[PDB]
Amino acid sequence: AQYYPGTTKVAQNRRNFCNPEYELEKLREISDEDVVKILGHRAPGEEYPSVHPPLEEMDEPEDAIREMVEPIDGAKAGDRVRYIQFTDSMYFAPAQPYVRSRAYLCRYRGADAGTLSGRQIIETRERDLEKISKELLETEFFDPARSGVRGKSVHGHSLRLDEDGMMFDMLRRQIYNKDTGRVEMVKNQIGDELDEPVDLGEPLDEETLMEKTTIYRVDGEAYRDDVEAVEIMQRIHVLRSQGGFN
Amino acid sequence: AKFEDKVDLYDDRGNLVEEQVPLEALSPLRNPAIKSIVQGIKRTVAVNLEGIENALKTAKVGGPACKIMGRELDLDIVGNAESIAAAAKEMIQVTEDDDTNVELLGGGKRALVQVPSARFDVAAEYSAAPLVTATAFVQAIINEFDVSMYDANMVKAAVLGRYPQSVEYMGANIATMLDIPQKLEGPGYALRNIMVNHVVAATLKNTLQAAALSTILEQTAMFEMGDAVGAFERMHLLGLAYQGMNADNLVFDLVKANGKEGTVGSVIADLVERALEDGVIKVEKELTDYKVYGTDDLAMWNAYAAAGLMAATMVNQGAARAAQGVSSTLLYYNDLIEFETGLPSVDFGKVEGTAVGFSFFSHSIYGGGGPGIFNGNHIVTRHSKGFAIPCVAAAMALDAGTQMFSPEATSGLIKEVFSQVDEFREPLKYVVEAAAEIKNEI
Amino acid sequence: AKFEDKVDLYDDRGNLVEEQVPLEALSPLRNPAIKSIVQGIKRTVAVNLEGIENALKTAKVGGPACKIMGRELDLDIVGNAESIAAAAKEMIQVTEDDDTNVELLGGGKRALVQVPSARFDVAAEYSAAPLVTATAFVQAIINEFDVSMYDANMVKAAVLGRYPQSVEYMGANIATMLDIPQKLEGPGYALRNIMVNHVVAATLKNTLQAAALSTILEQTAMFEMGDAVGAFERMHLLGLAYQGMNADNLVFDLVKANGKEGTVGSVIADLVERALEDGVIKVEKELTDYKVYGTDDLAMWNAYAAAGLMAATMVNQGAARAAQGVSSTLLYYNDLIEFETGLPSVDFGKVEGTAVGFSFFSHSIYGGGGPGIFNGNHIVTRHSKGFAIPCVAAAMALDAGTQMFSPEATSGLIKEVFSQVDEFREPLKYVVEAAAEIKNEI
Amino acid sequence: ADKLFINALKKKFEESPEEKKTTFYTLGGWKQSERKTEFVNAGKEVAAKRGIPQYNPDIGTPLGQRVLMPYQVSTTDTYVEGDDLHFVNNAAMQQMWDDIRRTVIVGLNHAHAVIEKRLGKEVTPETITHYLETVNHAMPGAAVVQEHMVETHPALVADSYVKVFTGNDEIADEIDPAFVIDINKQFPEDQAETLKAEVGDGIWQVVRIPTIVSRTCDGATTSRWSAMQIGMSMISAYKQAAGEAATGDFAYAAKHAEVIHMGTYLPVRRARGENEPGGVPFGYLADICQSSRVNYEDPVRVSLDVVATGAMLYDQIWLGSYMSGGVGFTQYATAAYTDNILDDFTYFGKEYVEDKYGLCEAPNNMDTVLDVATEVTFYGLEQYEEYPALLEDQFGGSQRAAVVAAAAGCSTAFATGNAQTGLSGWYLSMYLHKEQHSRLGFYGYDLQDQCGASNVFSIRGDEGLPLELRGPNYPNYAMNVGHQGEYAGISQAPHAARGDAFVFNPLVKIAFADDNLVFDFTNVRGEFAKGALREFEPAGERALITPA
Ligand SMILES: C[C@@H](OP(=O)(O)O)[C@H](NC(=O)CCCCCCS)C(=O)O
Ligand SMILES: C[C@@H](OP(=O)(O)O)[C@H](NC(=O)CCCCCCS)C(=O)O
Ligand SMILES: O=S(=O)(O)CCS
Ligand SMILES: [Mg+2]
Ligand SMILES: [Mg+2]
Ligand SMILES: [Mg+2]
Ligand SMILES: [Mg+2]
């Protein structure tokens, strides 16, 4: 597959995020337990709540499609559907809202992905969400200064940075340690305080941000200069218009 | 025939049934089984005799929480259902041995009622079914128990609710698949104002049969609306064949190839591959490490794209066994395919647009709800002309129990009564066989 | 036969046509001429090609006084009407020898379009006729003149108006006798939302034919509403026969015996006499210089009283050649007959009640208008179940020019186009002949 | 010269607009705001008085971790906090809607025929003036025929009256000028001649029923109220029987046959009668706005005054209350009429078109759309990239999408003189925006925008329509903020560039060229500012009948 047109680094980065063959760079290590605490849906050690029985106990009807589509583990178990949501700064965060949604539905099974300007969300079965959330937090999808995990009060994607280069956050869920240059998450994604903060590592430097970002900007790579990408968008507009008429 | 196209027809297990059938043998205007389904939907009414009886016993009539103290009537309706049903049938039928049908279910608790076709030959629309059924059962109940003039108006209230003070049958103990004509978003929309949950209920959650019935209703509505006239007729017929009837086994095969490990993106890759091989699309132009695809037949590209869209829904929501993500699949299948090919998405953007609002109004405070309460007449999901709603039906069919407003919550009476009609429960079998039987008359 | 009643059928000149016809031979459910009239009204559209041309040349589209400067298009539509009509017919038909009909009138200024019956077999209601006709003519006009993508939307606006921003086809240059389903006062009312002027226009002001078409529409609606089911069926059949179909020449004879000098009061006297002679009523009790009448057959009394009501309208409004008094006739014929006999008036007081509000809303500031703008779906005149509106049609047929909102003001397009269809213009003929042909299969 | 939005950005923030970094969290939350402070103290008083807790700054999340910005009302030097632009808090926005809702246009052409032909009486300018004197007594709720009638208090209903207009200059001069909307005095000469040619010898009434009645009742009341007092005034002035058959022709004429509603009724899911905001087509809204007869030399100003009219009505009152409610959609709308941002983007596009093509001289085709809409879209987006303060100002993507696309679409229509290609440019802007920043608007922002391109030029039943005829009930458009008001501006744009006197209905244009309205429709944005400063005096209050 080709995923996306264009000849900028931005276009290539958009392609890499979507490409399931492309190995996302791992930048940090987060414990399984700390993923659960960030998500905030259950306590580590707690059993997964269920919304319906396991599929094996349901005896569901003869249906060639059901037989042919393997459910994800959480669906077999009857897990709740829960979520993780990210806000990405327009100042060169690596991932961006439509990039995320496009990439999730190329990479992950059983995904409900939504895109907004200030938030991007994925809802799926609880135990599968935890495996996905680790990769979304450990890899280049995430920078702890220009990206944030926020289930509410998402304001920030369009705001100026603070003096440390951190994105604004109403609820100050992620804190830059000026004396050590590392970001700690001190609350879960809905804003409740954590017993012990989680280390998220060092912010990427601006040079690396520019190299990895998927946003076009005049002070990075401008969309108007990626003429092959622009041409394809104008083409879709023209063909949609003609199709609708005749 | 007006079109040269022919399609291979398959059954719901992936088996060939008939080869190279003219496209118009699947047309609502020509296929007699579609005619049977549409007329059956117009004329079929479910009556809840247990509910009528309980409403009279408690004087709970006219809507939620309503009660008139002092008006209670204790009548043994379920215990006399056979005699009530027979008296009702004589009033409903036009002649002895016509196509009237009145069957009791659940030991007299419900009644399946199919009003004779002759009544609709001299009717403008479809309300004769509930209104003739309602008054026949009201009269039969009054006659069975010698209900007095002074009390009979409570029986009326128990059957048809607060009508005519309300415009709808508010609190009624009868049910239809269709809603009243006043609630149409526009003329010609009636076959679209059928709740997705009703379709899933009538087909007992068989994914391909729910997709088929939904597609039949949506695309038949497009003829009544005039959308499938002239230059657009072929597009709509191809969408009906490929997205809803598993033409050429394309949907089935895409799901087979992607069901164990697939994603939406992997279904897209296979579909583009198949479209290239079958000659539907061709390389038109080369950019830097990117091929621009073109097509000489937009209607056929649309149909292929729409079959993949179905398969992607089946694969994504089938994996989660959770319907809610269908709004995401409908959006990003189409968004991804456009930047994969340089060609327009299904319904030239209208499925993607429908999916945007459908996502918002199924994950926000402002309205809508869960996937099963939507329909082609809903302001949120009316914009695509038949290519989005059948995927919602398929996704709800695959839902294992994640919805609070499930078909069991909204459509129990439909499940119990309408699923009994063979053409409603397995429409794919009957439409395909009828198409073979007429293949050489088209 | 369910009912043993038989009637003698006459023509619009009082000559007998067939003796001892069983009542149900006139039933909307059985009589094939009525089926043909109902299906015809559903499927017939008038296209004003002259109006389309003028709207485009001036860019006057979308409603009263509306105009979009800079959008004017100058197309010679009327001069190419034959080619446009042929192209549109190819889009409207289903097959090459179906009942599709497209005929040009007034030298191409107007078109009579009858959409094929087959499209309504697989339709929920009747809106396919305007919608399929509009898009076929829009596409045919675009293709004839190679109108560009950029301008075509103006052709759409000239044909169908402000729809879908408006719910109605506001500013449209097509016309039907039926209105959009959203405007029904209640489910099953569609055949009642036909303006009286439309009926009078289509029958070219022949009084009896206007009465008959109005009565056929009203009483057929009573079956779609479920009002003529079970215990009430016979009452409505007898009302159809005696009030709208001049059964037993009763309406005719009463008008003949009273036309030269008669009043409402003298018609009543002759009717009571006749109902006595035929044994419909009998003296039940004597008061002081006053005979109280009774009846063993309320439905037959109602039908006789309904015929006298028709005759009273004809005599009273015919003498004035001015329709306005029909509201007074409908009131005091029934008020007088009750105190004359001690029996209840037509429709058990509902005609009298309808006449009260109808008089008020045709002689005051609050709403309504002249007799010709009312119909069975109007809130003022919906209350009687088929026994009032046919008298209004007769009264307007006899008006000699006292009305500002006359049929020529409201219904000119219906006059020119729908009067061309024989079964719409002379329904009494076709229905009587059809009842004769089947009299032995009942 | 500086961009037009720079002054506003300098007054909002201590930093210079180009700076990328600022400080948060030390402003004191709500205490930074005079308006929030007023609200906190009022909430304490309300809670104490009624015995039920109400506004409380400690519920939910703590507002004001960033600067709570003032907003410049565009074309003015008035700066106000955004709460002063909420429709609930702004009597000028409420009166604008009331003045539309309580208005209907009613012909006298059928009525006068009934008089002459059915009754056999004469109609002269003298009888018309007598009728107008009678109906201006009757219309507010006062009696002309019956004994022992009780009546409305004239001071409560002082805003209700009836005027006429006609294209026949001779009749207009015979009628007492107190009752006449003088087309020649209210419109420039070229516009007046077009309007008079449309109206011809027809005579039309502009009826305004009382605000207090409109607020008590609904929009569907207006044409009924109007028709009853027209009917009584016709009875009185032309000496009919007080209730004969002919009286019914006048009622049918005034209620149906020659009535122009401002909005048409809506289908059941969003059931509403006539003269509600959802029924008002975009062409009508542009014609209600009177900027076109005062600012005709500047087609940007005319177009953006229409945007302001529609953004407020359609997003804040219609979508933000009638169809949802609560805190609502103030800033989805204010993005279109504050800080001179949209004005900058659109003045740029007008200069682009005028230099390359000349106004209205570009080919009306898709080549012009791809050119103008792309160039203006890239310009607008670049301003947010060069000025971090601007991006923090219009912080929601929906807001930015609406403003950029409005500039692009209006500019495209300036080039082609046709609103349908302007509409195509609106949608292309959306697609480019979405790919440039990998975001667009809220979750459901671009439902209509993805449907958009294919439905611009469609001709199918519920798809095809010229933009001027579309409105809030056009199917794709029926649900979402950030579009409807901007569409009204695109509808106005080609007609402003061409110098047209009206967009869609000349009777509507004339009916609001009336100095006795309460809201000043020639200066919509100035009126919003006056209401924000609490200096607007509405009609319909009940102070006269309530205690001190
Ligand atoms: C969708 C529909 O809601 P329901 O699904 O019928 O509950 C509709 N609301 C809306 O359109 C909300 C529009 C305003 C809020 C969203 C602005 S983007 C309505 O209330 O009639
Ligand atoms: C009849 C109908 O008027 P129209 O014939 O549709 O103009 C209707 N008015 C009324 O019912 C007036 C009722 C209030 C005044 C009379 C009270 S006795 C209405 O406005 O919808
Ligand atoms: O977040 S949502 O897009 O659902 C609503 C924005 S106001
Ligand atoms: Mg690990
Ligand atoms: Mg096979
Ligand atoms: Mg005697
Ligand atoms: Mg003033």
Side-chain angles (χ1 to χ4, degrees), chain A residues 155 158-160, chain D residues 8-14 24 27 29 32-36 64-72 79-85 330-331 334-335 338-339 341 388-396:
Chain A
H155 203 61
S158 47
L159 269 59
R160 291 164 304 170
Chain D
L9 299 180
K10 289 195 305 173
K11 176 119 190 203
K12 294 173 194 255
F13 305 117
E14 271 203 277
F24 308 112
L27 291 127
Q32 67 179 281
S33 162
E34 169 185 88
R35 191 62 67 241
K36 298 312 190 179
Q65 299 313 307
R66 56 157 294 167
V67 171
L68 297 175
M69 315 178 275
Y71 290 103
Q72 181 192 23
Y79 286 78
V80 294
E81 293 190 80
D83 318 70
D84 303 336
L85 297 170
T330 302
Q331 287 166 124
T334 60
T338 55
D339 299 342
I341 295 160
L390 188 63
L391 187 58
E392 176 166 326
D393 190 11
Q394 306 205 317
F395 53 86

Side-chain angles (χ1 to χ4, degrees), chain D residues 73 84-85 90 92-93 96 308-309 312-313 316 337 519 523-533:
Chain D
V73 181
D84 303 336
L85 297 170
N90 191 309
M93 299 159 185
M96 191 187 96
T309 309
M312 197 297 288
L313 182 56
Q316 303 183 237
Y337 62 81
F519 185 96
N523 191 13
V524 175
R525 286 185 275 178
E527 291 287 77
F528 293 172
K530 188 200 293 166
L533 296 173

Side-chain angles (χ1 to χ4, degrees), chain D residues 105 260 262 284 287-288 290 505-513:
Chain D
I105 302 156
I260 308 307
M262 303 271 122
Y284 278 27
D287 285 335
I288 289 171
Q290 296 288 300
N505 190 303
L507 306 186
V508 174
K509 174 60 68 182
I510 300 164
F512 286 82

Side-chain angles (χ1 to χ4, degrees), chain B residues 185 189 236 335 350 385, chain D residues 434 454 460 462-463:
Chain B
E185 282 281 316
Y189 263 72
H236 288 276
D335 190 51
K350 294 174 166 94
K385 293 312 177 55
Chain D
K434 160 172 166 189
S454 72
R460 303 206 285 184
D462 69 356
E463 297 173 0

